[PDB]
């Protein structure tokens, strides 16, 4: 277990000795991201914003993560008024702005979120530039390769949560009848299209395998290439250069300490090699689907924006998502709306970076607090559908159903466009549907209650569910909405 630390240490001996105090501080920052301090955030708030925050039901919000909710709730307690022991519209906007300022400074998370596209205007300019400087300086530190003397004499190990690659499959990976076992069925789906993988940040790996901690059932075993650059962090730990490619050599179920884990064997290869495979796939899926949809042969509609560790599945699931899409929506509705999207250079974007870092969003969303990360998104200004692979939509079974919901937004767009082409608007912004929403808006899904646009898209998704039960359910519980959507569909195919 410890017999190989010494020769890695000696290999990087000069490198470790020549490390500046600033270099060391940088590596330390990379390993331990800087959390926000409660008192710092509290003191920065005005007296009215303090009074507002302490009245807000934080757990009610839908855009705040678990982590962000807990931190804010702790602020509420520390803020002390007279009642202290010895969501609205105003409150939503406040929380959306405050969210941006309670994020820890996390270099590896910034790289993963952006997929290396660190110029993406998804964070405040000042911290965005600081990330850039740090990342550049880290790249400069990681200059010594593992070399021909050691690349095939060691394995590098990493434990990983399944939710990092796929939170959808991750919800069922563990056997529900026995948590020491892996669900063999869910295992097969995870492994099926896992052929390659990309690291856009700095992998922190060990020379000897280490016990998995909470919620880690994936145990990576990695061989580097001679050219792979790295740094020694002592204690048998390495930090690897960013932007490296990984070919998946084997995925197997293994037993350790009477618990079942998933072994992932991977070989480091040039990232350019993997990116070539992705481009050929984008070239292929576009040629295939232009023919199916009857689009011009030169149309670029489908785009792969992938940069992270489950890369091959993002590509392959695009074929599956679109097939289900074509199978559950009538062909003539699909042709009309897709052509409208294409007419505005709209895209179907499949990605494993967070959606605020997708150009088809942030180009038309300067306000960072108005930017959105989710499983799926539709942006009318760019007429694009965005689908985020790794995440898991709350109250949403799979990616295909998410996509259909997003296509509902597109249907919403085109229908409203047909009513008035130069003064274009959403059909859900018309008084007629607003009235329908005010009456039936609470009769479908919980999220459907949010606004007219989401109610429409939810009603649309459910109307095209493979479950013949759910369709009837929408007709019964939201008859006016059901009728309205069918009316728009008729309006579209006759246009
Ligand atoms: C139910 C459902 C959700 C999403 S989603 O990606 O998860 N989503 C809504 C949301 C996000 C966060 C917290 C709660 C809800 C986004 C915002 C959505 O409406 N897409 O157009 C996409 C598609 C879909 F059908
Ligand atoms: Cl093994
Ligand atoms: Zn939506």
* Nearest in space to 379 (alpha carbons), one of 350, 401, 404, 359: 359
Both tokens of 338, joined, read: 């897709």
Residue 84 phi/psi, 5° resolution?
Answer: -70, 140
Of the candidate CATH numbers 3.40.50.1100, 3.40.390.10, 3.30.420.40, 3.20.20.70, the domain formed by 271-495 belongs to 3.40.390.10
Q: Whose CA is nearest to atom 17 of ligand 1?
A: 374
The owner of tokens 């820890």 is 104
321-344 as b/e: b if 16+ CB within 10 A: bbebbeebbeeebbebbbbbbbee
Tell me if residue 375 falls in helix, strand or coil. coil
Residues with a catalytic annotation lie at: 406
Distance CA 352, CA 365 (A): 20
Can you state the angle between helices 452-463 and 431-440, rounded to 10 degrees? 70
- Spatial neighbors of 223 by CB under 8 A, at least 6 apart, are 151, 152, 155, 156, 266, 267, 268
Q: Known binder of ligand: residue 364?
A: no
Query: In Å, what is the CA distance from 229 to each residue of 87, 140, 187, 198?
Result: 49, 11, 32, 15
Phi, psi of 462 (to 5 degrees): -65, -35
Pocket test for ligand 1, best of 350, 393, 444 (most atoms within 8 A of CB): 393
What gap in Å lies between CA 66 and CA 104, rounded to an integer? 14
Alpha carbons 58 and 79: distance in angstroms, whole number: 14
Pairwise CA distance, residues 424 & 470, whole Å:
32
* Ligand 1 atom closest to the CA of 461, numbered from 1: 25
Contact at 8 Å (CB) between 114 and 353? Answer: yes
Q: Which CATH number fits domain 1-35+104-270: 3.10.20.30, 3.40.50.300, 3.30.70.3150, 3.90.176.10?
A: 3.90.176.10
Whose CA is closest to atom 24 on ligand 1?
Answer: 402
From the list 284, 278, 282, 348, the residue with the least C-alpha distance to 311 is 278
Question: How many helical (H) and strand (E) elements, i.e. helices and strands, does the chain have?
Answer: 20, 12
Burial state string for 412-423 with b = 16 or more CB within 10 A and e = fewer than 16 = bbbbbbbeeeee
Bridge-based pairing of strands 348-351 and 384-388 is parallel
Cα 394 to ligand 1 centre (Å) = 7
Q: Does domain 36-103 have CATH number 2.30.38.10?
A: no
Q: What is the DSSP string of 125-186?
A: HHHHHHHHHHHHHHHHH---B--TTTTTT--EEEEE-GGGT-HHHHTTSB-TT-TTSB-HHH
Instruction: Give the chain's largest Cα–Cα span.
Output: 74
The number of the ligand nearest the C-alpha atom of 260 reads 2
CA of 445 to the centre of ligand 1 (A): 11
Ligand 1 atom at shortest distance from the alpha carbon of 393:
7
Can you spell out the DSSP letters for 77-94?
Answer: HHS--SSS----SHHHHH
Closest ligand 1 atom, residue 62 Cα: 13
**Alpha-carbon dihedral 199, 200, 205, 210, rounded to 10 degrees:** -60
Q: Are 15 and 144 in contact (CB under 8 A)?
A: yes
Q: Which residues, chain by chain, have CB under 5 Å from ion ligand 3?
A: 454, 457
What single-letter DSSP state applies at residue 35?
Answer: P
Query: 21-30: long-range contacts (C-beta < 8 A, 24 or more apart)?
Result: 23/137, 23/141, 26/134, 26/137, 26/138, 26/141, 27/138, 27/141, 27/231, 27/233, 27/239, 29/105, 29/107, 29/134, 30/107, 30/108, 30/134, 30/138, 30/202, 30/239
Minimum CA distance residue for ligand 1 atom 20: 377
Cβ(376)–Cβ(355) under 8 Å? no
Give the ligand whose atoms come closest to the C-alpha of residue 455. Answer: 3
Question: Ligand 1 pocket: which of 374, 380, 452, 454 to mutate (most atoms <8 Å of CB)?
Answer: 374
Q: Report whether 261 belongs to an annotated binding site.
A: no
The answer to whether 470 is annotated as binding is: no
Q: Which of 63, 356, 370, 376 to mutate to test the pocket of ligand 1 (most atoms within 8 A of CB)?
A: 376
Residue 64, SS3 per DSSP: coil
**C-alpha dihedral sign at 222, 223, 224, 225:** negative
**Cβ neighbours, 10 Å, residue 96:** 18
3-state secondary structure of 406: helix
DSSP 8-class letter at 448 = G
Give CA–CA dist 266/218, Å, rounded.
Answer: 12
**Nearest partner of 405 among 359, 451, 445, 456, judged by Cα:** 456
Q: Give the 3-state secondary structure of residue 279.
A: helix
Q: How far is the CA of 275 from the centre of ligand 3 (A)?
A: 30
CA–CA dist 216, 287 (Å, integer)? 39
Ligand 1: centre distance to CA 374 (Å): 6
Tokens standing for residue 178: 């026995």
Resolution of the experimental model in angstroms, please? 2.2
β strands within 307-371, DSSP E: 348-351
Show the CA angle centred on residue 197, arms to residues 192 and 200, nearest 5°: 150
- Burial class (CB within 10 angstroms; exposed 0-12, middle 13-18, buried 19+) of 16: middle
Report the separation in Å between the CA atom of 460 and the middle of ligand 1, taken as the mean of its atom positions: 14
For residue 376, give the ligand 1 atom closest to its CA: 6
CA dist., res. 97 & res. 255, Å (int): 46
Residue 211: partners with Cβ closer than 8 Å, 6 or more residues away: 257
CB count in 10 Å sphere of residue 95: 22
From the list 401, 403, 359, 356, the residue with the least C-alpha distance to 381 is 359
> Looking at the chain, which residues constitute the CATH 3.90.176.10 domain(s)?
1-35+104-270
**CA–CA dist 445, 401 (Å, integer):** 14
Chain-centre distance of CA 392, in angstroms? 9
In angstroms, what is the span from residue 381 Cα to ligand 3's centroid? 15
The DSSP output letter for 241 is P
Strands of 270-400 (E only): list them.
302-305, 348-351, 376-379, 384-388
Which H/E stretch holds residue 39? helix 38-44
Which residues approach ligand 1 with their CB closer than 6 A? 62, 372, 374-378, 393-396, 401-402, 405-406, 409, 447, 454, 461
Approach to solving:
X-ray
- Provide the β-strand partners of residue 351: 305, 388
Give the dihedral of Cα atoms 486, 492, 493, 495; nearest 10 deg. 140
Quick one: DSSP state of residue 291? H
Location of each CATH 1.10.2030.10 domain in the chain: 36-103
DSSP symbol at 13: H
Q: Is 388 flagged in the annotation as binding?
A: no
Closest ligand 1 atom number to CA of residue 406? 21
Nearest CA to ligand 1 atom 3: 393
C-beta atoms surrounding 244 within 10 Å: 25
Q: Which residue has the tokens 């910034």?
A: 110
- Listed in order, the ranges of the chain carrying CATH 3.40.390.10 are 271-495
């Amino acid at each position: 277990r410890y017999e190989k630390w010494e020769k890695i240490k000696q290999h990087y001996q000069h490198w470790s000795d020549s490390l500046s105090e600033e270099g060391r501080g940088l590596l330390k920052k990379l390993q331990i991201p800087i959390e926000p301090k409660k008192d710092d955030i509290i003191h920065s708030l005005s007296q009215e914003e303090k009074e507002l925050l302490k009245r807000i039901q934080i757990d009610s919000s839908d855009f705040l993560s678990t982590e962000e909710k807990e931190f804010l709730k702790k602020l509420q307690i520390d803020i002390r008024d007279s009642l202290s022991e010895e969501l609205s519209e105003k409150e939503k906007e406040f929380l959306k702005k405050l969210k941006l300022d309670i994020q820890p400074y996390d270099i590896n998370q910034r790289l993963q979120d952006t997929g290396g596209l660190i110029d993406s205007p998804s964070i405040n300019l000042d911290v965005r530039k600081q990330y850039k400087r740090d990342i550049q300086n880290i790249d400069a530190l990681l200059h010594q390769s593992i070399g021909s003397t050691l690349y095939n004499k060691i394995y590098l190990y990493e434990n990983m949560n399944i939710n990092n690659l796929t939170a959808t499959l991750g919800a069922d990976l563990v056997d529900s009848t026995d948590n020491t076992k892996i669900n063999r069925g869910i295992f097969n789906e995870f492994k099926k299209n896992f052929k390659y993988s990309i690291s856009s940040n700095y992998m922190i790996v060990d020379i000897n395998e280490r016990p998995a901690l909470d919620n880690e059932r994936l145990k990576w075993r990695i061989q580097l290439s001679p050219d792979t650059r790295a740094g020694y962090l002592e204690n048998g730990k390495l930090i690897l250069q960013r932007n490296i490619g990984l070919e998946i050599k084997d995925v197997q179920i293994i037993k350790q300490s009477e618990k079942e884990y998933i072994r992932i064997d991977a070989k480091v290869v040039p990232k350019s090699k993997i990116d070539t495979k992705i481009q050929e796939a984008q070239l292929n899926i576009n040629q295939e689907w232009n023919k199916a949809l009857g689009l011009p042969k030169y149309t670029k509609l489908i785009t792969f924006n992938v940069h992270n560790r489950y890369a091959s599945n993002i590509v392959e699931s695009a074929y599956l998502i679109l097939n289900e899409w074509k199978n559950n929506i009538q062909s003539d509705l699909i042709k009309k709306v897709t052509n409208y999207l294409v007419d505005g250079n709209g895209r179907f974007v499949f990605t494993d970076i967070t959606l605020p870092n997708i150009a088809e969003q942030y180009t038309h969303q300067d306000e960072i607090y108005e930017q959105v990360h989710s499983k799926g998104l539709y942006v009318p200004e760019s007429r694009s559908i965005l689908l985020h692979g790794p995440s898991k939509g709350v109250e949403l079974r799979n990616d295909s159903e998410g996509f259909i919901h997003e296509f509902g937004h597109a249907v919403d767009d085109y229908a409203g466009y047909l009513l008035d082409k130069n003064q274009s608007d959403l059909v859900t912004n018309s008084k007629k549907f607003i009235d329908i929403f005010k009456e039936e808006g609470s009769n479908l899904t919980s999220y459907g209650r949010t606004n007219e646009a989401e109610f429409f898209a939810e009603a649309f998704r459910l109307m095209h569910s493979t479950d013949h039960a759910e369709r009837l359910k929408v007709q019964k519980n939201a008859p006016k909405t059901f009728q309205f959507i069918n009316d728009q569909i008729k309006f579209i195919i006759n246009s």
